[PDB]
Amino acid sequence: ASCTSLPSSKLFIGLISVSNLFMGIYTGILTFLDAVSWGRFAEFGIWWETGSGCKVAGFLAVFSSESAIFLLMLATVERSLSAKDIMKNGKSNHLKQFRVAALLAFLGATVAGCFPLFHRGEYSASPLCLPFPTGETPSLG
């Protein structure tokens, strides 16, 4: 909200917070669905599981988790590069490079999330729509 220079640390905190947005959104959708099915989950069970909603929620959760982890490694690598320049040169700036790396990490996360979609049955293993070694064994493992 403050129109400042937004240094690299603040931007990294912000983007990790956006990953937090998707985590919280996924969890809140879960609750919302559970509250809708208060005492009547079985009625919505199959419809949700085979429906597009389960795929959407599972992909969103997987993407949010993987993106959080990847943003974390990007932030740690950037901080280490800043420290290395501090003890080596005196100035570090890979703003465009790190933005490109963040976008590539988002691409990898989305690819991982969409991979179960093409195999027709990986995501609907559980109502939570979470990769488990219960149904499709090889790909999920």
- Residues followed by a gap in the chain, C→N > 2.5 Å: none
Closest CA to 66 of 10, 13, 16: 16
Task: Report how far apart the first and last C-alpha atoms of the chain are (Å, whole number).
Answer: 43
For CA atoms 50, 134, 114, 76, the dihedral sign is positive
Instruction: Give the integer Cα–Cα distance in Å for 61 and 25.
Output: 9
Q: What is the separation of C-alpha 30 from the centre of its chain, rounded to a whole number of angstroms?
A: 16
Q: Contact at 8 Å (CB) between 122 and 135?
A: yes
Q: What does the longest C-alpha to C-alpha distance in the chain come to? A: 64
CA-to-CA distance for 86 and 116, rounded, in angstroms?
Answer: 43
| CA pair distance 92, 76, nearest whole angstrom | 14
Give every CB contact of residue 108 below 8 A, 6+ residues apart in sequence: 66, 70
Q: Where are the beta strands (DSSP E) in 1-141?
A: none
Experimental method: cryo-EM
